[PDB]
Design a protein around this nucleic acid. Structure first.
Lengths: 260, 124, 188, 153
RNA sequence: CUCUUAAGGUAGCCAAAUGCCUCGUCAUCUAAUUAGUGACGCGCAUGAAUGGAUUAACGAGAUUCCCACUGUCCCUAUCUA
RNA sequence: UAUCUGGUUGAUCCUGCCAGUAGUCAUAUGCUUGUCUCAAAGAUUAAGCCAUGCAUGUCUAAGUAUAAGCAAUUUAUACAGUGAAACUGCGAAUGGCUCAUUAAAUCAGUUAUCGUUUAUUUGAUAGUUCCUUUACUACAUGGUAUAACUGUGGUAAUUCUAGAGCUAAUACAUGCUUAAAAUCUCGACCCUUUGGAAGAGAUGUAUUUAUUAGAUAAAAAAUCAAUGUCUUCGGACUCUUUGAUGAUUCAUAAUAACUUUUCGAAUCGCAUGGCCUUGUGCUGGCGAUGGUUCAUUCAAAUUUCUGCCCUAUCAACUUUCGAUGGUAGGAUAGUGGCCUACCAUGGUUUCAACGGGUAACGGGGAAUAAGGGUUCGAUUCCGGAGAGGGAGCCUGAGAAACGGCUACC
RNA sequence: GGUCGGAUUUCCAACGGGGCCUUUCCUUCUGGCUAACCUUGAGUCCUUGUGGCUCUUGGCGAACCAGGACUUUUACUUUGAAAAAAUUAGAGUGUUCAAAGCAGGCGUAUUGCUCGAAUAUAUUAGCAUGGAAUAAUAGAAUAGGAC
RNA sequence: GACCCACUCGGCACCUUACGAGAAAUCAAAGUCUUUGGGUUCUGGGGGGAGUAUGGUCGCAAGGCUGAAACUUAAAGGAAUU
RNA sequence: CCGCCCGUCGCUAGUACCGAUUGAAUGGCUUAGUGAGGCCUCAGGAUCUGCUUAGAGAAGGGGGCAACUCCAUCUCAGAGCGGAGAAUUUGGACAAACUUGGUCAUUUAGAGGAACUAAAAGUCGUAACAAGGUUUCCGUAGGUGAACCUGCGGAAGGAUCAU
RNA sequence: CAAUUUUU
């Protein structure tokens, strides 16, 4: 009613941020975002809680005035600036480069990538269109439209970006044996790479998804996303390798992590 | 305007109050190792209750069920990390057979007693 | 003040639907404008979200369409003769959607006969080859040519007079003028 | 639902902002526009060869079909150009561990090109709101009865 | 149980047109009430076809009140045949 | 974690209550009270009333600075460091609080928006600007019309307010200014008719109207008019041009008009360079604000699909003030009897509608616990309604706001 | 049980799963794939020859796609998708246990190292898929029937 | 044609007996019921107040149908032995 | 059976139920009316303005006898034509609040009337528990001071399962 | 024929 909601408390953002319960307060509310829902995360949640660089709320805002944060070469001194998916939060001095991927335990990641290969994102398309006065364009995760693309690719694939602007390079379709990747939901983002599609013309879309567990499951289309050619992948996957390894031998693996 | 922190009660009084030998059976259990009240044998029996309530639900469920193969095997090791019973009764069905005075036996009152040094549970 | 949603307006079965959430702002219907003729006294209104729109009052000259040529020259008006829904609107000579109006016959004749030179109805060589090549192409229909004779053209405000405020529409052509001469021949 | 110079009553209604060239002797001497419904919904030829206008029609008017689709039977052709539908269904009560038969009726706007009477197990679709009450519209009738096309007495 | 002659107000009803005492009392109407209406009752002296009680429609019958309306009155003036 | 005991009798068996028993994230109360962490609190009845004080303000390298405020010291010798007020922009529409209204209403899940808008967040973004003709004249930069301040005022009064004196712009209004090409209309016409054409001008987007295309199950010909290319010169030759959906009158392009002509940078910061013709010559960095349009995002608004407490000493509710539908409109951010004129008599129901009650906010849950459940949930989280009682309205992107206004009680 | 709370060369019995074939389950027209080589003409490393190969000629179109055309509708039920978290159950965890919480813990403590922050449960409504018993179910009667 | 005998159908009942059932008296149904589910309509939650008050409906009336609450208090009660 | 118990009446008490008051109040629909204020609009055009053009005191002096003739400034002017336009005010649509009737539901006051129920044997009587001394109990009707009695068709919870 | 009361 009556206007937007410039606050939200904790317990209202989901588990994948891993905040505290007994802070007894308001959550970090994300600002208005380029990309997606509050199932994304703002940058301060990535820094002071996952990467653990600070304690105070005055403290994390004081880092950004020194100008070390960077996505895509863009300045973005907003404190609670939201962070999309696979949108590499590169740094200044301290020189790290973090790609936003999903590990095997629900929430996102703390994963470094190298200096080179960090100058490109990876982009889901959602809407290809000819529009005003014959100017073709695509859209992205953030909806960063790109003038004069590769013509007639389609909606629903992935797009390589050149980071001077869009300047798209390579189309990656969907066929009987490629890479696909879940993004969101109860069984978000391990790998299933494909097994066989379907359509369900008219209502919704489903895709059969075959893990390295070598059984299958099915997640709907808005989590479905393609990475690339099979066994290539463009992003070094984090150190869970995308299985959903089962709980009966999750326990047998973690005391074989400690050696006892 | 804040988030709570929970609380819980960790005992339950027995239903029928007055049986002559039953109160004196827990006077044998009072008189064994020097308790101070009647509440702290209610609560391990309460811990006997909802562990045996927890023990009943896997036994009625399926064999070669991984929920039974996880929380039956992790249950019996936590049952023996405190060391109530030894390796001789590690086959997941003696958790039903467990008796009051055995949860009592690994308390720090009667462990200082049994390991010399105190002569008496009241001195312990 | 007057509302538009259905928290009044008795339900399907017929119960007296009891109320809460008294009359809001995001359904408000502004009071009408019931526009007339009389040459550009128009006021605008502030609207929702950051936008602007036109209450036209007292309009008499605006653009039309034939539509067989795509002409659209701002001609004057003379008045309505048969409103398609009700009949009180012609005793005061207003204009709405689909108002059957009559105009002047004059400003399109400067377009028509300068472009063809026939001449209805009874100089350089760059355009001399125009009517000497559109043989029986400019000719429309007999009853329309009879309708030029009284100096009036039956027009139709297809645009909305009070939302966008334009003086806009087209003129009757083809079977539709036979519909507004279904009864309008024998109505008196 | 309308004959006798089908564009009949006091006003004049036509398929909006489409004109035929008012002099050239082209094929049907009209440009009758229709809408492909899709999803296997065989748009019948009664809208293609028809003469009605009916802006509310899903096959020649300004409405698509974009929601869910439902079923049910006809109980009242007593209206003008609309029919109401009684969806019958069972319902589980958790307490007594037993079912119960409930229903509720729903009005549905119908194109005049179809043909619908009692019985007539019908398929309707969700639409944009079109009246005070009618929130749906029909897509196909395609239903027999207790030996229609066959019985005589 | 008993006496004057025989049997000793039952169903009901009331300060009623029937109640002297008496403008009886209580409640209600109004600003005030010897008037009205509803209950009281051991009723000078109510009462069962010398008919007792309750009655829908009606009354040139008698009453009390309310609402509209006006020289009835405040407070009178004038005009006509 | 499935547990029972006493009393109808002279005694016995039994249907069946009362009492006894245990917990309450369930209240009050009596008595008693040492340790330690954790923590609900004027919900129940009167959403009845209020003293008092506080809960919404906002500044940078980078808006508006003559403060007759400062602080200085060299600078900016018009300023540049600050710095009140006050203008401008922005917030105030979140947050918190209560449950009186509220029984298909809100609400839980569950789609839909082809039926819409959205300051802010992002990313793309405007070679035409007036064509009064070339002396309208600033495009090397035009204007008002003013606050704070100063002077004397009024009333006992309130975040009450006057006439006079100048000045600000990112407030406010004008307003040009950096190309080329192609098309269409006209005509200087001569020179011819199957002809050409200097040059008179327009062309950005918005806005509204009207049209056209946006096609594309399978391959060849005869036949009548004009006839592009080329030639043996019977006459012959053409890759002859399509985005998404399930689909559109969709995005779109094109044509002729269109607007009390909407918009298309006359705004500030740090830096000082290159240039060769050292001339107020020509180039050029990194930003900050603000602006149209598209797609997002932040959200709002409608909307389908199911579920509801007690009540038949509630048996037929609904329309001539729309009840149900059609027809056409008026408004609307857009849909719709939302409203209006005409027309049709329709909607729900013995699966309980309608009417009444409800110590009824709706859900995620909580308490007791064999299973099967009964009863609460005003209250921590989500959504709704309200700010003494019903109305109405401005500002603003967002309100029918209430620590905003108007009127009545 | 091979030889390390534990592993096979074929093989034993049971458990359920699928292709079939029995008179026998068979959505179809147009193409691009294909999909078989069951083809076939020849050569056809290594044998005495598609067991390892090709140019591959009717050389089986629909398992990978989208058009023409329909399709007895329901319950029921498996699985998955699915309900914001806390709360419920529930693995780790010296908050000292417990109420809790989500941490911590391991080196080397000379200026680092890593595990975690699980997991289920959540029913009625809707969606998709596997199943065809049980209970409804309608298409052949003046044949206006199927092919 | 009535009867005698044997049989069977459907009746209305009777006698024995219990395996069975229950509180007992008793029962071929009151059986096949904690070894609890063949369908299907209705009725009762202590006794009193009471088939009473108000409300409705059917009657010409007597009255009939539907039908509480306030208050009251431990039995009223069913069967059986002496 | 020196058992049990039934009813009127008496006293002590309590409990709801009705009831004249054209009852009273609160709340919800309602017909008929008055309609505060605010919006959209028809007019109002006060009071602030600028533009242009025809004459001039003063003198501006493109030059000079005056003149001619430059825009004219200190500004009246006589005309147009616009720009913002405040009070005021008609019409239209929202409607707070009020008046008057009727219904619906809840609560509350009432002279007094009959009931019910408890409560030390109070009198008058025995109605029912044995064939309760006239067997008992139903439905209905009549009488009575109270139990009760009687007539009518039943039934045995009977005092006969029996010709 | 008629037989009543005899009292937590």
């Amino acid at each position: 009613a009556r206007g937007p909601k410039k606050h939200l408390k904790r317990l209202a953002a989901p588990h994948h941020w891993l905040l505290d319960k007994l802070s007894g307060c308001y959550a970090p509310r994300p600002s208005a975002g380029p990309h997606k829902l509050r199932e994304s995360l703002p940058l301060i949640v990535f820094l002071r809680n996952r990467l653990k660089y600070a304690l105070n709320g005055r403290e994390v805002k004081a880092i950004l005035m020194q100008r070390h944060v960077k996505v895509d070469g863009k300045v973005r001194t907003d404190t609670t600036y939201p962070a999309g998916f696979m949108d590499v939060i590169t740094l200044d001095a301290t020189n790290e480069n973090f790609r936003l991927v999903y590990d095997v335990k629900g929430r996102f990641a703390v994963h470094r990538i190298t200096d080179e290969e960090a100058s490109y994102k990876l982009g889901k398309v959602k809407k290809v269109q000819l529009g005003k006065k014959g100017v073709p364009y695509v859209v992205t995760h953030d909806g960063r439209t790109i003038r004069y693309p590769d013509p007639n690719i389609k909606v629903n694939d992935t797009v390589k970006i050149d980071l001077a602007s869009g300047k798209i390079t390579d189309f990656i379709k969907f066929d009987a044996g490629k890479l696909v990747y879940v993004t969101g939901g109860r069984n978000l983002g391990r790998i299933g790479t494909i097994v066989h599609k379907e359509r369900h013309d008219g209502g919704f879309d489903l895709v059969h998804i075959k893990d390295s567990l070598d059984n299958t499951f099915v997640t709907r289309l808005n989590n479905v996303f393609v990475i690339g050619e099979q066994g290539k992948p463009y992003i070094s996957l984090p150190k869970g390798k995308g299985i959903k390894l089962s709980i009966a031998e999750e326990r047998d693996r973690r005391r074989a992590q400690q050696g006892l | 305007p804040r988030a709570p922190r929970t609380y819980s009660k960790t005992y339950s009084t027995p239903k029928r109050p007055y049986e002559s030998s039953r109160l004196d059976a827990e006077l044998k259990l009072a008189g064994e190792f020097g308790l101070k009240n009647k509440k702290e044998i209610y609560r391990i029996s309460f811990q006997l209750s909802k562990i045996r309530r927890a023990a009943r639900d896997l036994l009625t469920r399926d064999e070669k069920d991984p929920k039974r193969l996880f929380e039956g095997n992790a249950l019996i090791r936590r049952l023996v990390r405190v060391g109530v019973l030894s390796e001789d009764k590690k086959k997941l069905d003696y958790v039903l057979a467990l008796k009051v005075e055995d949860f009592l036996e690994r308390r720090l009152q009667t462990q200082v007693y049994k390991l010399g040094l105190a002569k008496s549970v009241h001195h312990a | 003040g007057i509302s538009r949603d259905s928290r009044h307006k008795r339900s399907a079965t017929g119960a007296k639907r009891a109320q809460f959430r008294k009359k809001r702002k995001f359904e408000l219907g502004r009071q009408p404008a019931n526009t007339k003729i009389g040459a550009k006294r128009i006021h605008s209104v502030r609207t929702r979200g950051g936008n602007k729109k036109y209450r036209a009052l007292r309009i008499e000259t605006g653009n039309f369409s034939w539509a067989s040529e795509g002409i659209s020259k701002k001609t004057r008006i003379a008045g309505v003769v048969y409103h398609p829904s009700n009949n009180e609107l012609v005793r005061t000579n207003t204009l709405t959607k689909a108002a059957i109006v009559q105009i002047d016959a004059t400003p399109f004749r400067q377009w028509f006969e300068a472009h063809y030179g026939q001449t209805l109805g009874k100089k350089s060589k760059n355009a001399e080859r125009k009517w000497a090549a559109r043989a029986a192409s400019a000719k429309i229909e007999s009853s329309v040519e009879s309708q030029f004779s009284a100096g009036r053209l039956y027009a139709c405000i297809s645009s909305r007079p009070g939302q966008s405020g334009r003086c806009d529409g087209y003129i009757l052509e083809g079977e539709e003028l036979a519909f507004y001469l279904r009864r309008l021949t024998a109505k008196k | 639902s309308t004959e006798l110079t089908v564009q009949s009553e006091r006003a004049f209604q036509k398929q909006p902002h489409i004109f035929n060239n008012p002099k050239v002797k082209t094929s049907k001497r009209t440009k009758r526009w229709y809408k492909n419904a899709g999803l296997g919904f065989k748009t019948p030829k009664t809208a293609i060869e028809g003469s009605y206008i009916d802006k509310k029609c899903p096959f020649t008017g300004l409405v698509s079909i974009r929601g869910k689709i439902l079923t049910g039977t006809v109980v009242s052709t007593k209206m003008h150009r609309t029919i109401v539908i009684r969806r019958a269904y069972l319902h589980y009560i958790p307490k007594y561990n037993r079912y119960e038969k409930r229903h509720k009726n729903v009005p549905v706007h119908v194109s005049p090109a179809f043909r619908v009477q009692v019985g007539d197990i019908v398929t309707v679709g969700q639409c944009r709101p079109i009246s005070k009450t009618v929130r749906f519209n029909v897509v196909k009738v395609s239903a027999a009865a207790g030996k229609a096309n066959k019985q005589f007495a």
